């Protein structure tokens, strides 16, 4: 399926998935066409911050559906 | 421009960040618990807050700026969305504290 991740900077990264991948899989397909690193990720869906365990199915994200990503500041 | 029409298309793509701002933290205002909210994420709450504050005087300088009606209506719109999220917020503070 294709989810749509969106940044607070204006950018809209389209990605190609699977109801069983995982977060932490989600955050690595992030850095292989985004460039960041997992660990500067905060990945958000309805208000809800997603722990790199759980699948896209667990958090019942479908297709079409839309998550935000929020870049951890280095200096707070 | 004077008219507002004029940069349009630089316009719509900075209300388009605008409001993904709103929307996050409207949304993490929802689905989180006050008293049960992390540091963590009280945290990212201010960051939003912080963003969206400076981003709120941004629109109120652009208001009068602008002569298009339509444009100043939907400016005024995206106003009344950023103090609703504050005041939110600030509901969200006392439950928490006190």
Same mark, same amino acid.
């Given at each position: 399926?294709?989810? &749509? ?39 958000? &869906?309805? !208000? ?26 280095? !200096?707070? | ?28 205002? /929802?689905?989180?618990?006050? /008293? ?35 444009? /100043? ?23 928490? /504290?006190?």
């Amino acid at each position: 399926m294709q989810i &749509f991740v969106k940044t607070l900077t204006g950018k809209t990264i389209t990605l190609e998935v699977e109801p069983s991948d995982t977060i932490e899989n989600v955050k690595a397909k992030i850095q292989d066409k985004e460039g960041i690193p997992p660990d500067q990720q905060r990945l958000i &869906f309805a !208000g809800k911050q997603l722990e790199d365990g759980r699948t896209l199915s667990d958090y019942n994200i479908q297709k079409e559906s839309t998550l935000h990503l929020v870049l951890r500041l280095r !200096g707070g | 421009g004077p008219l507002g029409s004029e940069q349009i298309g630089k316009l719509r793509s900075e209300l388009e960040m605008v409001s993904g701002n709103v929307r996050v933290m409207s949304e993490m205002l /929802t689905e989180l618990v006050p /008293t049960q909210a992390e540091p963590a994420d009280l945290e990212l709450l201010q960051e939003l807050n912080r963003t969206c504050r400076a981003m709120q005087q941004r629109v109120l300088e652009l208001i009068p700026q602008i002569a298009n009606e339509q444009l /100043t209506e939907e400016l005024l719109i995206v106003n009344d969305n950023l103090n609703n999220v504050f005041l939110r917020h600030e509901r969200f503070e006392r439950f928490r /504290t006190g």
